Design a protein around this ligand. Sequence first.
Ligand code: 04C
Lengths: 250, 240, 231, 244, 195, 243, 212, 235
Amino acid sequence: MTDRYSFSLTTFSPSGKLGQIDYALTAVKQGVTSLGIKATNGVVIATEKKSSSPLAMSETLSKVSLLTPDIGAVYSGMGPDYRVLVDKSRKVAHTSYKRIYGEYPPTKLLVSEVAKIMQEATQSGGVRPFGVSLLIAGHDEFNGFSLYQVDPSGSYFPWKATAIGKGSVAAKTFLEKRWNDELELEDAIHIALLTLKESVEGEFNGDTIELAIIGDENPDLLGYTGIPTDKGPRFRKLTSQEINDRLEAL
Amino acid sequence: GYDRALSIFSPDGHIFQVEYALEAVKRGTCAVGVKGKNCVVLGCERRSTLKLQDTRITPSKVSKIDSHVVLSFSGLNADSRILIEKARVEAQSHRLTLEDPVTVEYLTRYVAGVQQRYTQSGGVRPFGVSTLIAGFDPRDDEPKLYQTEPSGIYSSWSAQTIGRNSKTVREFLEKNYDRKEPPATVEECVKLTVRSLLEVVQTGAKNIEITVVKPDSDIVALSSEEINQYVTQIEQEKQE
Amino acid sequence: NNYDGDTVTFSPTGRLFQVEYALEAIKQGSVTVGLRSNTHAVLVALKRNADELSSYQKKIIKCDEHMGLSLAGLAPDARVLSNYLRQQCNYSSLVFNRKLAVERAGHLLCDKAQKNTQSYGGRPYGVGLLIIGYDKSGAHLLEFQPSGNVTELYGTAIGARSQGAKTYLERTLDTFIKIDGNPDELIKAGVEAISQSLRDESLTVDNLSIAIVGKDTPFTIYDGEAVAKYI
Amino acid sequence: GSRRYDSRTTIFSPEGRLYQVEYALESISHAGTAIGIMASDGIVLAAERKVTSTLLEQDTSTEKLYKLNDKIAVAVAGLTADAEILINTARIHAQNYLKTYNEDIPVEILVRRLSDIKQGYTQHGGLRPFGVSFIYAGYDDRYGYQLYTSNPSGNYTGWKAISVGANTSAAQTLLQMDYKDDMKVDDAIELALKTLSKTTDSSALTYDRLEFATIRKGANDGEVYQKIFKPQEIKDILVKTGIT
Amino acid sequence: MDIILGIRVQDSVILASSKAVTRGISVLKDSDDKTRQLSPHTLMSFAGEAGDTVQFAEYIQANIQLYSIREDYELSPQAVSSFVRQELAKSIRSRRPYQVNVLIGGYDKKKNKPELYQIDYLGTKVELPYGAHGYSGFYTFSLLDHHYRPDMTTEEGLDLLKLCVQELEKRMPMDFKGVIVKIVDKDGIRQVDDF
Amino acid sequence: TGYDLSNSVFSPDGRNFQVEYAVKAVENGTTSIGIKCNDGVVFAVEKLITSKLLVPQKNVKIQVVDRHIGCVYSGLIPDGRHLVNRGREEAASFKKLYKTPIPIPAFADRLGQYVQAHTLYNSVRPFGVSTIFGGVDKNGAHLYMLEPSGSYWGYKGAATGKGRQSAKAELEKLVDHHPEGLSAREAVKQAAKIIYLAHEDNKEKDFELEISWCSLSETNGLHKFVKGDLLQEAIDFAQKEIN
Amino acid sequence: TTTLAFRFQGGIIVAVDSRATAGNWVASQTVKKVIEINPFLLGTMAGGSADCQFWETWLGSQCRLHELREKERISVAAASKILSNLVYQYKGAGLSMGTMICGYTRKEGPTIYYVDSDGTRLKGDIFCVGSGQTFAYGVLDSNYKWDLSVEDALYLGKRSILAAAHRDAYSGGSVNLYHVTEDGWIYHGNHDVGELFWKVKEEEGSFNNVIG
Amino acid sequence: DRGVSTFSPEGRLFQVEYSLEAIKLGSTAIGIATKEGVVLGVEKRATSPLLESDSIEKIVEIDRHIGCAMSGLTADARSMIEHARTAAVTHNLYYDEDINVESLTQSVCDLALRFGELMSRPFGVALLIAGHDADDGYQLFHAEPSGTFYRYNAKAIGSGSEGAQAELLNEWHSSLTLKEAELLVLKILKQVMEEKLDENNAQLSCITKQDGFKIYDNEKTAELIKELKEKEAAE
Ligand SMILES: *[C@@](C)(CO)[C@](*)(O)[C@H](Cc1ccccc1)NC(=O)[C@H](Cc1ccc(OC)cc1)NC(=O)[C@H](C)NC(=O)CN1CCOCC1
């Protein structure tokens, strides 16, 4: 018994390709489109809620996940792989940072830790790479707002705006035309909804679209009052109703 | 832990991984060892497809294991560092428990044992390295030159060469080295070593390294000009 | 064919080929015979040499004062298994002050051999054993196969041409079973049994190996001039 | 068992080559070119970013050039994720040396240890090697300014000027042509950029597709300063040499 | 063990170390050298628990010599002292700590300066113009406070050291059988045979 | 293909061929049966007499677990013994912690999970035995049959080995003709008959009958071997029915 | 115990007593406190009898393994250091050993090493070890010269043990003498203190404290 | 590939059988056992004339009463010898006596099969273990990588083994003297060796109860070679 697979399942081919990473990226290509746009006073991450069955309750399945109060994540590719990454990402933020410095990690460093986890699945014994690309949006005091993309290889790149998955090629071209360095958060949400409508085929409403923002602090969502320095989470998931309001003035 | 038996017997009774490690040695730059009446000289080829090198800081081909023993090699450069490090640690460990520096035979025997262990241990491949180990035992003026190889066998040599085109320079040494009368002086020994490398090398410029080891921890590396004088002298006598 | 790379693989007809190949090593091994009465149990083993300059490979091993076996196949594997038996017999003595039952000895060998046939990396034992002993329920004879299968018998034989001795004992069953209180006659029956497996060679003084255990006889081996009596 | 699926990453070819190391070098040959040039009064590190997108955040980005300590930096060519594993090790190794000896680590010692780690992955463990080549640029008070390179085999060598990644054959010929020993930093800056500009697979070399760094003694008196160039500073140095 | 002294002067470091090895009511040896050469320009004297002292000294010696061979370079006295301190700092929280106090006298060839470090078994390091371990300090520190000058020669340092040994031979309860004196300077380590 | 070369590999059907191959080893083995009765269970097995040299009554194949459970199996005999050894460890640890002897359904899952575990990895081989077992606990009598895959169910009657179909047919008749129930002493006699009837599928070598039983009234809830007069009575009953 | 060994012009003299004690109970009078490691090495025993006996015969096995592996007799320095490094590993555990590794080799000449259980290892010309070491020192030091003859040195070693055997309550039995030369060790007999005392008293005129 | 501890269809371990082929490539080693002693002789076989032949160590001391000669991948023998020496000395430590030659051989052979997936492969070297003890007198053992050992009156291993063994079959009798055995090893070595036999490329040794295990000098062997040539010419 015991894990006898102590050797790499991802190896270099004669041409220099890492097969499993390439194939994992193929799995990401098949995945549903998600995107991220960085504004001057916030970031927006969005994706389509592909329902497996109309009897299924798509509210119970959350594609956009809070990692820290000021960092959110969305993905394209294999949902189960994403779910466990979010679990590990949430924990590493605590173990390797908050329990040491008494504050939440800045976006770039949390991203770095997630990348490390995905890189190890590329080299460690008896494991395949993760079949997802992440888009991590976040804010921190000294870097401000930021948006990162993390690939199955463990590589990560900062973006002004981007899209991953099914119709990423067309979506990226759409974003290049619309993005400027003076976009306000509400303008970015508007563009996000426009870009996403291109890739979505069926219903397009607040129940089939999942969308969150990294913006201003939300004291109402903090849960307590009395500490002035604690001002609430910058991450906020837009409600089904809040999305439909913006779809009328679309 | 990774357990795989990588070095294994084949139907004809060969351990291919050990034999393929010898091919890596054959690819490596030539190294030669010649021992005289009162000295040993280690000569080493350095390939000249690398210009813009920084020779101050580039790892030298001949390494000191202790103040009285040296080690040159042919084959994989990265592999050789692991053997050298282990040998250097064992050298200090021997001084610590025996209160006497290692003999050249003992040090060689240790390095050869390490190489052997990597031929029947799970999860590891053999060292793609053959070494020439030279020096003088403590309080002894008799020169010592030993050779090791990936399989783990080791032996003493009056003169020997390893690496690429070593069979050519071994041919040279076999007729030019007299057992009854080894190079009586340092000059004679260095010249015979340089001559033997000039059969294979190309130019006698920054392609040849020479290190001379004498008794009682007397080791010095020759500079370009010093070596170049031997190259100049040999070529003028050749035109005859 | 494709299902003989290791012991952990079943064939499409439900066979373990590595176990069967281990069984094959026994068939190449030199013949050895086992038989018992109600009072004594006897091993008779034909030893094998490399050539005329070599010694004759010892086939019989003692396990305790009341137990021992003979081997056919890989001798080092017999050494491992005999050593394991020696320890189990000894554990029973030190802890319980109890001589290990020959039946339990068989159960223990079965379970040890079995584990090697169900796990990756390992291999089956390449030897067959004939265990004789005398315990609280009289004389015994066991046949161990490296598949794990242990079998209690009145008499048997394993090795090359063992079918000759095994047929003979099957005929002689009613005779030799009632050789009670007579060691030399029970051995004679065993020496005659092993003779049915001989071809071109005959039993010489440094070729024959005999062991005996019984009611008032500790497990003792006879070699050299001590077996000249029976040729 | 699992033997069936083992690639055997740490074995020799019949020719005496390490398959995986050779294939990792092939991987690295497609990565963006990185150049190191050592002058008498400093070192230049120049690297080309892999085909950039216009929406990529350029200023808050790090792909090629990384800082190991205050005296040593590295240029990367290969898998970035692999490189970061090794960089964090190298960063820790430097701090261990400082903690032990109360002296900044000599460049070669740091390089050797990082190269020794790579070597290990080619001889034991059954894991794939790191698909990374480094250019180490650093200073210490023994040898002064030093350039090294290491590759997946775990072999390292010292250089006056060197390139890794894509088009090294062409890049090395151009460096070998125009390099001389009495060269200054500002000349080396110009050489590095001119070389990339000629070897690049892109149409034209621009500020947004470059990472640049210098290690000078251009601080105040007998001390070393690392300068990781900002986007605007690369834009200026590119105009100053007349490439754009 | 017992008496180990150190004096850093203008151009050298001078280490004095008692020759007596006592056990119970018997002086077993009166010519013991309580010092090891770590490198050509670095000397370490030691005092403390029996066995531990030499075992520790030779272990440090091996490590420094290993470093010298690996890098083909001599570690600075500062670097060696920091390495030694860390080894003792580990040791003190071990299952059985090294009970060894040391003085490290060295000549830094890069700075062209003598350097004297005092390190106790806890891993407490200090650079000093003059140092002592054990009860010796109680006499020599105040003596050196008075007579020491930073610009003294090696000869003046030896006379200053004779003054310490005389004071110890007068007021110390135990017979420590004199001292072995060694000088560390630009030309390396040498022993004064007539003291 | 190659899906059948490694254990724990799903074929495109969704099958583990290595387990199905282990079943072939079970089908090759001698016949064994189990009969559930009024207040207990009865086990019986066919022992092929390979040679005259086999000592009668001295190659016992039915095994006891704890003091109240009986186990019999067909296929690779050593594999069966390994499984019983585990069963005994499982039963010991249950009694150690919980005091009460292990219930039969509880025990059945302990073997079930262990056998199933040997279908999860390629580094182990599936068990080459189907095991019929059972006994009496606080809730009465239980009979079970466990297969190489780890699959097991409760049974009124169970049969495995080379003569399983012959035995199954005979078992189905007993279930139909006795809806109220079969007595323990009756089930012993029937077990003998069914082994003799199932021997027709293995009739080259003649055989030796071995029976055991647990019964709340007859054996006081404990596992015992059927020997002597009761065994010979059952053998005679079986001999009368084949003729 | 009282054991000594001293170096001189004609090699090394080694002398030991033969008493073993368990408190004030005299456990034995005929114990061998010298172990002959090889034809050129000797070991002396003082302290715990089992500790000395077990580890010094173990030392002999290590020295044999050295000459098998290195095709050369082990040095006195290396042999002593094997033993000292061993006992240092057991430091604190409670071993009790006072030993002297005496022998000749070509590279070293006659050499003596003091090794004890708290890890002390010392090269020297004269050592006395044991409960009666001080008594042996008193006689040995006051009569020692480098230029002693082999005959005189043998007697002084014998007389020094006798001195301690007399005064020290935990020393006695008999004297075992050894002489180590360039050709190896030579045994110079067992000398019972029962007879040796009176023989020395009479002939030497010493021991005037005792009733004659 | 395939398991290291895999059986062939004929009932043999592949790796053990392949290691036997490696031993056939090795240099010839011959041992002869008499009532006056056991003689061990080996072919040195220097690969080049520059190699100093006296550094070729294929005959080895295990204890004073046990010697050993090797053939095959001789680098593999180092850890076997190391084990044998430790086993021999350890037994002397535990029991204050010499260890039996058979017990020593058995201890060495226990390492043999300690390979698989322990070491990664069998040993590629065969050993001739010669010695003397009080119980069974002068003994010669052939230790293989199979874990099996046979006692022999005489035995040859290596490349010239089957030819030499057939020669030893004819020549050996139970009344050979030591001197007769010495010459016999030299005679048979000279027959199967490629290069011409002399004191530099062949080495003799013996173990006797009185003097223990001794490797002969090149001067002593040279005289036995000269004595051998004269005796063959003398009829
Ligand atoms: C003189 C006689 C003073 O004791 C010597 O030191 C002598 C040396 C010696 C060497 C080899 C063989 C015999 C004698 N030592 C003894 O005779 C020794 C004295 C001693 C007792 C106890 C000790 O405790 C650490 C240390 C020294 N006597 C013994 O060892 C006696 C025979 N045995 C015991 O006391 C048994 N003890 C030993 C310690 O562990 C508990 C059991």
